[PDB]
Ligand binder design. Structure first.
Ligand SMILES: [Zn+2]
Ligand SMILES: [Zn+2]
Lengths: 446, 446
């Protein structure tokens, strides 16, 4: 079906029609974008905290205001979805969700309280789209630049009452009803190991150093357990490139960092009146992102390679995580760099989807975040920074929603876009739980 | 073509699938929404500052988080468009536009500098979609809750170098090259009178009290000039309801307020730590919005009545103005009340469009604004307020982008939605200038 090849400003920004992104009437192109046929595969790309503001800021900096992101902006069907959480005590809406509650909403189809993973407000477990895809015989992949125990990758495989229950120790004190030695299903990491997705790639190697408190692998570290269970462990780009097959008999687990994988671009933090008092910043590539550390695009590509060998089809979730993290850290360059990172992964996904013809690609965010693009002369109360964009002009970014350093999430609805079979279901206003039902129905899961 | 009848959460928010807004696959409904046939009429509804955040806040308060705005959310084709302005000196992007530069972009199709009305960075005039529609023989209407000299209604009829040139005196000092007594075309109000749209309704009666400095009506007030030129002047709801015809021979000019028309709901201003220190607010209806002052919905309805009698078709622009104004004023209730106001007008427009079958209805904003929905416990540096929503839960709103009281506009891309012929052209990423070309081509204007 047609991908948007170029929606950059067609000419001279200062002349009549020069800033147009369209060259003609779109009715025919959109008609050719609509198909209700079954989706053989689904690739879901999540930008953590990548609301419309974050996409505009990153486009302005990296591609220029009249620029176009060949991945993110190329998806033809667009809509806006809501992502509120629930108050555990009252069952009433809680308008600003955290990563755990939003993640659970699109992976299980039920709203929950902030902090829950894979359970509803009554702490009852609900099956995730990954578990269901596995059950139906599809290949499954879970890729992230964050720790694999963080909310978005974890929600596909774990069901715990608190996102904080990363490994055995944390689970024993914070999630005692889930603690393995108290008869529960285990921590996020133990449940991840039990879930056995075919490809799992990300950081968070640190928690695999913990020893299981109970069960068959009591006393062994979760890394030893993974090896003993038949997992192919990979810890750098060379080893990852050597993997020829990844399947239920030999599942791939790539741990490329102790915590979160390295950020792509470095820059200073935004400061009080940073746009008034400090020079404009040009982001610099991070020397430590390294030739041995696979990029999000490389991990997506390897995952698509391995997963596409399953004739039944696959489900792959890819997360550009440190957008959110750096947005909390009020660091424009880190944030924008990770949106650029995600765009590359979305490009790889779109390329495959174009030629394969039966893949639904969906790009969206879990919740909106704090950054706002403000006028150059803004005298703001929070943190600000002036950035030198691709256009050679200054763009100021403001983070003004918290005094407690981390700039919070916000409740605004945001863009969801798709390409492929059943993509129509993201157009107009939808809710994050509708995404679960769209993916389930597209894939023919029951 | 189908309007979205109900995309409210279909059930119990706490149960599986209970928060879904979709009941089935949307491919067929979207296919029936696509038509490239000519649009006989266009109704453009602009929410001043109504970015996605403002729509989410207003929906949460008035309809509840799982609620649905029968007007605003009922439009089936949705996209996101960019709205950057230009720096007059360099011609480079200026990422945060003001009302004048955004208004000029969709009404003429050329980007301009902040503060310009109907002229490009070289101060050259470009014809507006209204002027072009008149020229082609279509009926034209310009409705707003703001002063008719404010940027959005003014941009359809005036071409001046500064939005501040409301009437003769202001134009003489701020726009001397436009000043009538210096051989220019006149002020915003004089040019509005010369432009002679069939229906013009809004506030701003104050500037009509000024006397023309030169020309045929030198020494008469602009009100006297309007009467003398054949304009039917109306100043309240009863008189407006009495108008049976409005046309070029007897154009309607309704001046319902000296400045901006009254706000719908009252509430206190957001304050530093207002969510921590003060009780939650319930907005109250404004006693002064009055039974003699027509609502935006009433003015839209009367305008559609009068304008639809022109067998050629019509162009109508309707502006819900005080969303922006109250957003600058950090007043949640004023802001949300005006989004509710606009929703009613969008409903009237959609009703007509449904039965008429050849009308393109477009709902969007000029730029994004400051309000963010944050967590109840937020310790924010700006202004905050806790609101009691339709759900019986608290929602906190933050305005943290300026210390100089007025909370600024922001550069984020925002929702644009449409229904009717050529509505496909708003889906995906577009630019505000594309809206001019979409309207022109839909209407068959040359
Ligand atoms: Zn976050
Ligand atoms: Zn404004």
């Amino acid at each position: 079906m047609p991908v948007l090849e170029n929606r950059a400003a067609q000419g001279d920004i200062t002349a009549p029609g020069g800033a147009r992104r369209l060259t003609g009437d779109q009715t025919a192109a959109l008609r050719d974008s609509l198909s209700d046929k079954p989706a053989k595969n689904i690739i879901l790309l999540i930008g953590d905290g990548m609301g419309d503001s974050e996409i505009t800021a990153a486009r302005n900096y990296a591609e220029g205001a009249g620029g176009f992101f060949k991945g993110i902006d190329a998806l033809p069907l667009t809509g806006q979805y809501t992502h509120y959480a629930l108050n555990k005590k009252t069952g009433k809406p809680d308008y600003v969700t955290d990563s755990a509650a939003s993640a659970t909403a699109w992976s299980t189809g039920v709203k929950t309280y902030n902090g829950a993973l894979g359970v509803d407000i009554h702490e009852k477990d609900h099956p995730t789209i990954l578990e269901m895809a596995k059950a139906a015989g599809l290949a499954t992949g879970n890729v992230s630049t964050a720790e694999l125990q963080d909310a978005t990758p974890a929600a596909l495989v774990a069901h715990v009452t608190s996102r904080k229950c990363y490994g055995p120790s944390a689970t024993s004190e914070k999630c005692p009803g889930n603690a393995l030695e108290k008869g529960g299903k285990g921590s996020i990491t133990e449940q991840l190991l039990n879930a056995r997705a075919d490809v799992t790639l990300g950081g968070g190697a640190k928690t695999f150093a913990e020893t299981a408190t109970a069960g068959e692998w009591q006393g062994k570290t979760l890394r030893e357990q993974a090896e003993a269970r038949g997992y192919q462990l990979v810890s750098d780009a060379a080893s990852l490139n050597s993997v020829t097959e990844a399947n239920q008999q030999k599942p791939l687990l790539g741990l490329f960092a102790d915590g979160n994988m390295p950020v792509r671009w470095l820059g200073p933090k935004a400061t009080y009146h940073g746009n008034i008092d400090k020079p404009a910043v040009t982001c610099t590539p991070n020397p430590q992102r390294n030739d041995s550390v696979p990029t999000l695009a490389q991990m997506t590509d390897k995952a698509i390679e391995l997963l596409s060998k399953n004739e039944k089809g696959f489900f792959l979730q890819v997360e550009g995580a440190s957008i959110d993290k750096q947005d909390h850290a009020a660091n424009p360059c880190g944030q924008i760099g990770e949106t650029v990172d995600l765009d590359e992964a979305v490009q790889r996904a779109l390329e495959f989807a174009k030629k394969e013809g039966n893949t639904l690609v969906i790009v969206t965010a879990n919740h909106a975040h704090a950054s706002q693009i403000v006028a150059p002369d803004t005298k703001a109360p929070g943190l600000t920074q002036a950035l030198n964009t691709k256009d050679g002009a200054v763009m100021v970014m403001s983070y003004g929603n918290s005094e407690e350093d981390s700039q919070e999430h916000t409740g605004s609805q945001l863009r969801i876009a798709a390409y492929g079979p059943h993509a129509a279901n993201v157009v107009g206003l939808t809710d994050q739980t509708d995404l679960f039902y769209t993916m389930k129905a597209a894939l023919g899961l029951k």
